[PDB]
RNA sequence: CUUAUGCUCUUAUUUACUAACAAAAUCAA
């Protein structure tokens, strides 16, 4: 037989290639097992070509060197297949090999969190009663939060048409939809499946979770309710960021002022030193365990809502073909997902600071400290961790060491980890943006002290909760040898240099902060500012977004989107653009390319045809109105 | 003219052939079984099976291409496990100790 | 003998084939067992 | 069990045609060369006009019987099964093929 | 229908009996015309003190999807 | 039932534009052929070939 | 506007999946007026799939359920895959 | 050798088809 089986057996291949792309196992029930060996062999062969082209084109897109408009969407498709495969594999081997946390770890986690809440006399968040005085406003704030997506939209399809009906019907019937929400928080435990769409950012592909709108309403109410009660009862301490009290570049400014205002950091009369540490918490939200999550939320919230929160994270997630069950990781795409993450942050953080120092930072419960305070100099002085803060998942710690404490802490590291070839300065990383003179100099006793701090801290948090690695960690040391304490909190990159270590005081431009000591009112340091290279590449990726989405769009929209992107660029960090060279090159490269985009709207890239009055005159006079 | 018929029976899809100066003929199998034939007589005197990899599919154990070197004492096989294996003729082996497979024909398989 | 191919995605001649053609077995390990009982014991202890 | 290989089925159909040929000779009993050319290499065989007709009529009649046997089998195949929903004859035909695979 | 896989490839037997054209291609211009021949603060806290033949299970693939998703 | 009568017809119609148009062109081509043949017959009724 | 399922629309959807397949849900909602391809997919994967398990509770199932809901507190999509049952029936 | 409607140039209004034409985004009330 030659001609008749060729139809059938290659359709088995095409079906099996679809099942591999969809992560369906492809079991043909009675299949001659040598043929199953063949079709599995070539599909692994086609898998290797398919996965290698996905890696090859993604490096090519990040370089930004002549990728098609189609190939960007094709590569978004292949990587969102591979990300969910890595997700579905990670779900399966967790379920074969059980939870990563040992029950002794979960016992210690629970015992610390109980002790913290007992120390603060925290009364847990109740279920919202029938007669709750703030109830209609919290629903109002929630529904406006949902509406503001659609106040800026024009053209709608089915799912938001029925969504907008629900908000409007909830406006008409506040008391009906409050009773429906309280009924869902009591009873409902099974939820509709969530769709993942993943956004192109040309450097990373980020996931976006689309929730059912009836579930979105009760999420947004639960979101707005819990945050109000958490901030009312003072759940989260002062050092948990983002806070509503300040915008992030005011956070960076209060951080550097707070670095300045501790006593005797800059004094290196003795051999005393200062170490700042930056760490991601890695796969923080990816490695949250629900059985721990539910039990810890019994501490903090009435068990009905805590049951609701655990129930909502366990939903079916489907892309196009691929469907699985998120039975381990947290979904950020929920509205209330904010609240768990900061709360799960507090669980990670109380490991790091311990019971005593986190009590010393956040102060007593009746009279809490502000973001940079201690009740005395001595409570500040009694422990080397002087300043702690947490911005989402980054961690910023400040260590003040006397000579003896630094020597013990590096000797015990070298006793545990020797270095005969003195290679501690090889894997050490510092900011390649600042120049080599005023970068963190690789000098052995500071390099060994820097690793010894991190080795101390990686022990404090287990690898089952988060993955704190040295490859993501950044340590800055200030010493006799290093006058620079340099860190990156938010797209800012900050270099602090004190006044006594400036040898000569020169006037600067407005890209340099003047850090003021409080009690002398005197300028005692200078915090130089630059932009992170990441946010620079985000803005270049953003401009490529304007250019690739708008195929044959009107000219004034292209100029308008450039205005929105550039104002957003310059308003968030304004001062740091003074000092950064490659950002200025990318501003030139972007603005010329968008002017080239208008020039490609016609068939002319002539300079003489396009004087700057064409582009830069406002819309009232008939120009683009570019900035 | 047909010189000789080898004892190739039970092999299935022979991907590659290589011939030594020493009349060692190689027959790479799609089953992973690689068999060495004396070229003059057409007799299998060794049959061997490879390991696939640390982790890989059971169909991937297959030889796709092969050659001897100029000397003839090395056999280089590129296989579908994404690897290259270098097969080496075992010294310190006398006729005794390893005659190989027995010279046993059957007339039932009418190959001859 | 090869079965005929019944696909869940394509249907080039638009055939109607019954639902049984188109359309795990393990347990949880003791890691989940020991985890939940320890948390409950710690909760009972914290209650005490 | 198994199917019958094309050597055996060639032999069995060979025997069936021998038995039928023998019954034709028996019924004909109850109811009652080679020259090669010199000019060319072509060869000439003297034949009766009978038994050439009889072979041709037999081959036609066997073709008729197999045609009508399959045609009646077509009639049964589209009248037997009516459980599953279909769209055309080719749907039921292909879904009879999936029933044969079970 | 109209969208078919191949039963056979286009054979060179048919193209051999055709008459040639003698059109002049850019890559058949004379080039390389000559052959070359061979011759106490650490106490208060909670608790302190390789190749696989699978492109999807590889270590580089895990380091890929952690960086390019974020 | 009108939804069901629409669904009953859509599930039992499997071809698309290209096959239905090919059917229509094939019927119209044969109709042109049948017309042209009977023309020749009616002209042959008159004796003119 | 969120409507309830009649047994008429129930029979269209079963005949739709029988022809179109379980992945072409916008093909299914074209036949099925007033209903969504999300809603069509949701009912087939929660109600209408004949592989699903709508039957009586043996005492092994009841002892297994009270074990799983104690060991995996409030993970009903997780428990329903362990029980090989639909989820809201399991609740 | 059977003999049966010749569309007018401009402007306005209304209706039908048609462009498989286009479109409120950041932001300020």
UniProtKB/Swiss-Prot annotation, chain A:
Signal peptide: none annotated. It comes from the Eukaryota. It is found in: Nucleus. Residues 112-602 are annotated as: Reverse transcriptase homology domain. The MPN (JAB/Mov34) domain has structural similarity with deubiquitinating enzymes, but lacks the residues that would bind the catalytic metal ion. Contains a region with structural similarity to reverse transcriptase, presenting the classical thumb, fingers and palm architecture, but lacks enzyme activity, since the essential metal-binding residues are not conserved. Present with 468 molecules/cell in log phase SD medium. Component of the U4/U6-U5 tri-snRNP complex composed of the U4, U6 and U5 snRNAs and at least PRP3, PRP4, PRP6, PRP8, PRP18, PRP31, PRP38, SNU13, SNU23, SNU66, SNU114, SPP381, SMB1, SMD1, SMD2, SMD3, SMX2, SMX3, LSM2, LSM3, LSM4, LSM5, LSM6, LSM7, LSM8, BRR2 and DIB1. This is Pre-mRNA-splicing factor 8. The gene is PRP8.
From Swiss-Prot, chain D:
Its main location: nucleus. Residues 20-32 have a biased composition (Polar residues). It comes from the Eukaryota. One of its GO terms (biological process) is mRNA splicing, via spliceosome. Belongs to the SYF2 family. Involved in pre-mRNA splicing and cell cycle control. As a component of the NTC complex (or PRP19-associated complex), associates to the spliceosome to mediate conformational rearrangement or to stabilize the structure of the spliceosome after U4 snRNA dissociation, which leads to spliceosome maturation. The cell cycle arrest of SYF2 defective cells may be due to the inefficient splicing of TUB1. This is Pre-mRNA-splicing factor SYF2. It comes from Saccharomyces cerevisiae (strain ATCC 204508 / S288c). The chain holds residues 92 to 211 of 215 of the full protein.
UniProtKB/Swiss-Prot annotation, chain E:
Residues 1-18 are annotated as: Disordered. It is found in: Nucleus. Transmembrane segments: none annotated. Pfam families: Cwf_Cwc_15. It comes from the Eukaryota. InterPro entries: Cwf_Cwc_15. Belongs to the CWC complex (or CEF1-associated complex), a spliceosome sub-complex reminiscent of a late-stage spliceosome composed of the U2, U5 and U6 snRNAs and at least BUD13, BRR2, CDC40, CEF1, CLF1, CUS1, CWC2, CWC15, CWC21, CWC22, CWC23, CWC24, CWC25, CWC27, ECM2, HSH155, IST3, ISY1, LEA1, MSL1, NTC20, PRP8, PRP9, PRP11, PRP19, PRP21, PRP22, PRP45, PRP46, SLU7, SMB1, SMD1, SMD2, SMD3, SMX2, SMX3, SNT309, SNU114, SPP2, SYF1, SYF2, RSE1 and YJU2. Belongs to the CWC15 family. Involved in pre-mRNA splicing. This is Pre-mRNA-splicing factor CWC15. The lineage of its organism: Eukaryota, Fungi, Dikarya, Ascomycota, Saccharomycotina.
UniProtKB/Swiss-Prot annotation, chain G:
It comes from Saccharomyces cerevisiae (strain ATCC 204508 / S288c). Present with 784 molecules/cell in log phase SD medium. Belongs to the NTC complex (or PRP19-associated complex), composed of at least CEF1, CLF1, ISY1, NTC20, SNT309, SYF1, SYF2, and PRP19. This is Pre-mRNA-splicing factor CEF1. Involved in pre-mRNA splicing and cell cycle control. Required for the binding of the NTC complex (or PRP19-associated complex) components to the spliceosome to mediate conformational rearrangement or to stabilize the structure of the spliceosome after U4 snRNA dissociation, which leads to spliceosome maturation. Its absence leads to an arrest of the cell cycle, possibly due to the inefficient splicing of TUB1. Changing residue 44 to G: No effect. Slower growth and thermosensitivity. Complete loss of function. Complete loss of function. The gene is CEF1. Changing residue 25 to G: No effect. Slower growth and thermosensitivity. Complete loss of function. Complete loss of function. Belongs to the CEF1 family. Residues 25-48, 76-91 bind DNA. Changing residue 76 to G: No effect. Slower growth and thermosensitivity. Complete loss of function. Complete loss of function. The chain holds residues 9 to 99 of 590 of the full protein. It is found in: Cytoplasm; Nucleus. Residues 1-52, 55-91 form the HTH myb-type domain.
